[model samples]
Target: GSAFCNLRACELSCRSLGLLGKCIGEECKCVPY
Candidate 1:
């Protein structure tokens, strides 16, 4: 299932996995630092 994405949630989700969180429109893009 897909849900709306925001900065705070993206940051936390990515950070927990040791990745970088980026928001593009309403999408959360996780990338390695």
Candidate 2:
């Protein structure tokens, strides 16, 4: 299903996990730390 992506939220979440965030294909994805 299609969903919305929040760049700020994604980056925050990824930062907490020691990773980087990016919007790919309209989704929030965590990149390698």
Candidate 3:
């Protein structure tokens, strides 16, 4: 559960950043990294 929680959190962060503005590259597309 820890891993899943962390991954989900990361995706949320990434998604939010993506909505805010174009980060270094795409959006959650970097999450799988």
Candidate 4:
């Protein structure tokens, strides 16, 4: 169960913040806050 981000750090950050869906699934963007 995993996905890839252009930058791995982005992936981990989003994952830890529970924003992966907003970042990847939506493929749009997260507030990044």
Candidate 3, residue 3: the lDDT equals 27
Best by TM-score: 2
Candidate 4 stretches greater than 4 Å from native = 1-6, 21-33
Off by over 4 Å in 2: 1-4
**lDDT digits (tens) for residues 1-33 of candidate 3:** 322234454456767645332234232233232
Better of 2 and 3 by TM-score: 2
Query: What is the clash count of model 2?
Result: 0
Q: Per-residue CA lDDT of candidate 2, range 1-33, in tens?
A: 266888888898789779899878887788889
Per-prediction TM-score: 0.55, 0.56, 0.33, 0.29
Taking the tens digit of each residue's C-alpha lDDT, what string does model 1 give over 1-33? 287778788989899879899898788888997
Clashing pairs in model 4? Answer: none
Output the TM-score of candidate 3: 0.33
Q: What is the C-alpha lDDT of each candidate?
A: 0.83, 0.83, 0.41, 0.51
RMSD of 2: 2.2
Model 4, 1-33: lDDT tens digits are 255545455566566666652445535454545
Is 3 or 4 the stronger prediction by lDDT? 4
Query: Which 10-residue span in candidate 3 carries the lowest summed lDDT?
Result: 20-29
